[PDB]
Subunit: 263 residues, 4 copies
């Protein structure tokens, strides 16, 4: 019980890649046991368990599609069996689809709402009773600057992320007199596959295949620091929210965005 | 000579409450109006007559906004009867009060479907004509609950926050055009949606006393200690639809007696 | 007849720009108007005639809003000439562009004094009469720079943020009365305050090319790629002063071409 | 080996309350610390000893932050005793509760001077060294009152709103450097600044009952029904000063028991 989160059991959805893996790493570094998650029996990154287990805590991986409420429940029940009560829930799994509103596919709209907002509701609902019984909990929702402002061609995603922030506030208010907090982190751009795919698409469509020009234009359109936020930095924000100094941080956004929301 | 003369408006869920008040004010300002609700015969049998009193063309079309095909049928009906949809007011909406832990899955899905996704469907279906004609207004009826949270309203706060985010994106995609998209955020307004909540509170806490329950409900959130009216929400819709609001884009007009100010 | 018929309005700094545009729209809506600037002889010698074209009573009073005693003289003049101040528009404001490191101390103080503290002085002096009469409108001309920051505008963003916080408190202190207080937050409007900035940018970056400098200046911040007009800011003031805004309290009306939405 | 080892911090108004809590947390995290208040002999004779318990270099310098020449003296004292100022915490602040109508002109000016303008003076004096060194933290202690309004706190809400606006500008002017600027927004914390307000309420409304007044004061605004602690604010400052916060720029860290969430 030396490190700040020693003994706490965390679940990070969509932690085979990107921000989720970064968060899982930082939580383990801080002493938490961690359950990793994605859709596949074999993640594309075969080393994720080894990477997170390097910090001396207990780690598991469980394949579950967060768009299926029964699989969300399976992920929580597996954690309870393997490691113990879920004490830190990080709702992170998420997808993007870029399109003008007029031609935004109906199925893509529904999919983004299902994963990026409703899945967080399902998991939070499943975890809250145990947290209430134990008198402690953290629900950390990975929103976006796109939950606070709009961007062109991201209608479904901005809607889901705004919704996720509204959901965050309600959960925090319903738990405000308890040792359970609920907060959201709002990253600006982070160089993960979700962003790389977008930059590749505009590089081909607009910049003659020049990935450096496309990266600079994509980043600097929105982010005054003219640099990406890192997955380690988002993880550090998750560790902060999970720590005792954040016992009275409730229903808020921690924006880690290079200045995007400031202007 | 009226400020919206000749404009064709569609107001979803306009058989009752705020939607009907908006329709009334739009017609007072000279717009033709298509009213809408789920029923072949709305409960209020005089809604067409009440809105038609201001000398504009009025229609009613029954369509459930949770069904994309019926949203499309509403838009096509308007195009056929009155002409292109120029003012779209996404207003139909529902509430369900429950703690998060026991919030029914189907009730969450229903609230997201109507209070957020149906606005996406109707906006998607109306924007092409608006772009072709170079003018439009999309007015989304959000809530103070789209800006802050309240206990036992997780789905509704989520949907209304999401509706405001959607508003911003549509406004930005149209920012260099004659189309604007904005949201109105009312505080509490005394409609059946709120009356049913006050009844539940009166029965649980105040021995059925609606006078007492209404004041307790209102004063928990609304520093003016008075309700916002359907006419006031309609006046905000007229303002957003008028030429003075050509450069109001992607914003919230909050009409809430001070709720968000504190 | 007209919505503000007979109401007595004071618009500070209404010899130019947004203030004159607000005064014009308030007069068009039927209000009597007191115009105000620093000079006995405003640069624009025609302001009283331009505002008086709408058939209401118009006056001019020279007073520097940075001096509480001259604020009081303006209110007293209005009370003697036209009657009690019913609509107060706190609009006079200045700008100074500089990095924080070299921002002159006296310029910081001057911006705080005019763009924030003068609104407190005028509001304090007008509220007793509004309370005695059971009605009032205080309309504070803020900025998008009261909601977000921009480089090289530390004092102005501070003052305008402060003005928005002040607006909320005044609104909460009057929430159960017939007095409201709100702010309007324009984006860029083509006034001398902005033209001077565009001139500086042109010389620093665009070799004196006003057109190039004007498109760069706008499109850095304002997605509509067009200026907001003084008439549009005036129409927002009329809306806030009307009966449909009786329950709009402590809020911002953002008229900005999409700036705050992204 | 601790996360802020070797960094030199200055915390203004750190003889009491939140400022002392921040100083303690920064030192626990490895920072050298300069404490500050108005008095040659602070009321708490032990502040230096308490902060120095964590094995870092600690100093105290008496200076009134409303006087730009004394802000400069504090910075120059720090440079001489400990080295370049790397972490600046603008914390010193005062409160005055009064309705707007009777708010004393002098108390308004005093609150603006200390709660807003002093942060500008100290920031302006510290930035040049931070830019040369390529690293810095400016942490401004705002309030939930910088994000929303409360009755009878016009000057304070204005100043704290302005401080948040200033924070954004400084962060944008430094966004491509190793300097960040951010604000912490606490809800109610049980310091003398709050205890004096509760005593006023108790004597005015609860017949001297401090326990009743405390619960009413707290529960009107703060859904957690508990006070935030000076240690928690300090932990937020340590987080902002840490490497994980290198890309947190121009934002608010709100530590308020849910106040802004509703
Ligand atoms: N990158 C950025 O700039 C920003 C990202 N965010 C948010 O960060 C979060 C992570 O995104 P990021 O790391 O960027 O994107 P990545 O695509 O790198 O990671 C996405 C993660 O989600 C998992 N995943 C996808 N669909 C499902 C599903 N249906 N069920 C379970 N797991 C799933 C993937 O795992 P697998 O493929 O193994 O199933 C992967 O682990 C998202 O919520 C995103 O909105 C917020 C702000 C900025
Ligand atoms: N009342 C308040 O305090 C506030 C309300 N709002 C918003 O105002 C909007 C109107 O609500 P309000 O007037 O209060 O509530 P009402 O219940 O009074 O009106 C709801 C309207 O929606 C219609 N409706 C319901 N479901 C559907 C559907 N699936 N398809 C089409 N029409 C439908 C009803 O018509 P029928 O029954 O005839 O089908 C009725 O006309 C909602 O979006 C609500 O969220 C926002 C802030 C405050
Ligand atoms: N232009 C823009 O893009 C935006 C402007 N604003 C705000 O709009 C308001 C008006 O600015 P705008 O019209 O652009 O600026 P202008 O410079 O065009 O007008 C400024 C007005 O203030 C008057 N004035 C200046 N100092 C004083 C003083 N001490 N006492 C009394 N009157 C004074 C001037 O009158 P005289 O010289 O005759 O004394 C003039 O009428 C300001 O508060 C500004 O911050 C907000 C958002 C955008
Ligand atoms: N307490 C709360 O609930 C909240 C407080 N805050 C903010 O926290 C900060 C500290 O507040 P809090 O700790 O509560 O108040 P305290 O009154 O407990 O402490 C105030 C500190 O400021 C010092 N001080 C006062 N005037 C000056 C001056 N002119 N120059 C230098 N130092 C001065 C005092 O030291 P000395 O008397 O020795 O000079 C004391 O150290 C303030 O900015 C306040 O607005 C924000 C949110 C909530």
């Amino acid at each position: 019980e030396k490190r700040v989160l020693s003994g706490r059991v965390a679940v990070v959805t969509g932690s085979t890649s990107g921000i989720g893996l970064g968060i899982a790493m930082r939580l383990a570094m801080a002493g938490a046991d961690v359950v990793l998650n994605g859709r596949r029996q074999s993640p594309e990154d075969s080393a994720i368990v080894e990477k997170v287990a390097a910090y001396g805590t207990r780690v598991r991986y469980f394949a579950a599609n967060m768009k299926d409420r029964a699989q969300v429940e399976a992920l929580i029940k597996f954690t309870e069996k393997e490691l113990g009560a879920v004490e830190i829930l990080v709702n992170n799994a998420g997808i993007q689809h870029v399109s003008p509103v007029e031609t935004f596919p109906s199925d893509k709209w529904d999919e983004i709402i299902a994963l990026n907002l409703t899945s967080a509701f399902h998991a939070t609902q499943l975890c809250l009773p145990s947290m209430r019984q134990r008198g402690w909990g953290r629900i950390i929702n990975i929103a976006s600057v796109q939950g606070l402002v709009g961007s062109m061609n991201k209608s479904a995603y901005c809607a889901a992320k705004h919704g996720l922030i509204g959901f965050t506030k309600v959960v925090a208010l319903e738990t405000a007199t308890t040792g359970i907090t609920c907060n959201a982190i709002c990253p600006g751009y982070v160089y993960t596959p979700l962003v790389e795919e977008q930059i590749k698409a505009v590089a081909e469509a607009k910049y003659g295949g020049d990935m450096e020009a496309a990266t600079q234009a994509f980043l600097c359109e929105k982010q005054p620091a003219k640099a990406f936020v890192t997955v380690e930095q988002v993880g550090d924000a998750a560790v902060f929210l999970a720590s005792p100094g954040a016992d009275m941080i409730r229903g808020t956004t921690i924006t880690v965005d290079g200045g995007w929301v400031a202007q």
